[PDB]
Amino acid sequence: MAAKVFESIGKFGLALAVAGGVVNSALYNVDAGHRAVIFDRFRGVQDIVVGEGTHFLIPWVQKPIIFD
Amino acid sequence: QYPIIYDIRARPRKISSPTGSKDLQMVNISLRVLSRPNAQELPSMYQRLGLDYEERVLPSIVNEVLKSVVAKFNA
């Protein structure tokens, strides 16, 4: 029983780490006064702005464009 | 919230200007100005002007005013 518990714990931790990495990559700290943008390929770049907060992108397609 | 401590305590400044005076004499005239910041609209101050605001303001206005008035005034 213990081995199954340890294996499940490890699997859950691995999934959690993957999620954390994904979220951080989709983040650029909007350092005070850093209005970035969100960016894709279907339309170019969304005509909407990332205000002066850490408004968020979807990864790798918004290569973090941190317009200061 | 980044309220990086905005020092309203006076941080002095001085600016000079070489001007072509009324007689086209190259007259170098100085001017010491005593500037302090406000509190009622600091949000825009830090948002736009960031942490450093006084460094972003005085020189051009002081130079232009000195140039104009000195060109108006004979030595």
Swiss-Prot record, chain A:
- Positions of transmembrane segments: none
Q: In which tissues is it expressed?
A: Widely expressed in different tissues.
How is this protein induced?
A: Expression increases approximately 3-fold upon entry into G1 phase compared with other phases of the cell cycle. Also induced following inhibition of mitochondrial protein synthesis by thiamphenicol.
Kindly list the places in or outside the cell where this protein is found, as annotated in its UniProt entry: Mitochondrion inner membrane; Nucleus; Cytoplasm; Cell membrane
Q: Which residues carry this modification: N-acetylalanine?
A: A2
Assembly notes: The mitochondrial prohibitin complex consists of two subunits (PHB1 and PHB2), assembled into a membrane-associated ring-shaped supercomplex of approximately 1 mDa. Interacts with STOML2. Interacts with MAP1LC3B (membrane-bound form LC3-II); the interaction requires PHB2 and takes place upon Parkin-mediated mitochondrial damage. Interacts with STAT3 (unphosphorylated or phosphorylated at 'Ser-727'). Interacts with CLPB. Interacts with CD86 (via cytoplasmic domain); the interactions increases after priming with CD40. (Microbial infection) Interacts with SARS coronavirus/SARS-CoV nsp2 protein.
What does the sequence similarity comment in the record state about its family?
Belongs to the prohibitin family.
What this protein is reported to do is described as: Protein with pleiotropic attributes mediated in a cell-compartment- and tissue-specific manner, which include the plasma membrane-associated cell signaling functions, mitochondrial chaperone, and transcriptional co-regulator of transcription factors in the nucleus. Plays a role in adipose tissue and glucose homeostasis in a sex-specific manner. Contributes to pulmonary vascular remodeling by accelerating proliferation of pulmonary arterial smooth muscle cells.
Name of the protein described by the UniProt record: Prohibitin 1
Q: Gene symbol?
A: PHB1
Swiss-Prot record, chain B:
Q: How is it modified after translation?
A: Phosphorylated. Tyrosine phosphorylation is indirectly stimulated by IGFBP6.
Q: Where in the cell is it found?
A: Mitochondrion inner membrane; Cytoplasm; Nucleus; Cell membrane
> Which residues are reported to carry the modification N6-acetyllysine?
K72
Q: Which residues form the signal peptide?
A: none
UniProt induction comment: Expression increases approximately 3-fold upon entry into G1 phase compared to other phases of the cell cycle. Also induced following inhibition of mitochondrial protein synthesis by thiamphenicol.
Region (LC3-interaction region) residue spans: 46-49
Which tissues express it? Expressed in myoblasts.
Q: Which residues carry this modification: Phosphotyrosine?
A: Y53
Superkingdom assignment: Eukaryota
Q: How does it assemble?
A: The mitochondrial prohibitin complex consists of two subunits (PHB1 and PHB2), assembled into a membrane-associated ring-shaped supercomplex of approximately 1 mDa. Interacts with ESR1, HDAC1 and HDAC5. Interacts with ZNF703. Interacts with STOML2. Interacts with ARFGEF3. Interacts with SPHK2. Interacts with COX4I1; the interaction associates PHB2 with COX. Interacts with MAP1LC3B (membrane-bound form LC3-II); the interaction is direct and upon mitochondrial depolarization and proteasome-dependent outer membrane rupture. Interacts with IGFBP6 (via C-terminal domain). Interacts with CLPB.
What does the record's free text say on domains? LC3-interaction region (LIR) is required for interaction with MAP1LC3B/LC3-II and for Parkin-mediated mitophagy.
Q: Which family does it belong to?
A: Belongs to the prohibitin family.
Task of the protein: Protein with pleiotropic attributes mediated in a cell-compartment- and tissue-specific manner, which include the plasma membrane-associated cell signaling functions, mitochondrial chaperone, and transcriptional co-regulator of transcription factors and sex steroid hormones in the nucleus. In the mitochondria, together with PHB, forms large ring complexes (prohibitin complexes) in the inner mitochondrial membrane (IMM) and functions as a chaperone protein that stabilizes mitochondrial respiratory enzymes and maintains mitochondrial integrity in the IMM, which is required for mitochondrial morphogenesis, neuronal survival, and normal lifespan. The prohibitin complex, with DNAJC19, regulates cardiolipin remodeling and the protein turnover of OMA1 in a cardiolipin-binding manner. Also regulates cytochrome-c oxidase assembly (COX) and mitochondrial respiration.
Protein name, UniProt field = Prohibitin-2
Query: Whose protein is this, by species?
Result: Homo sapiens (Human)
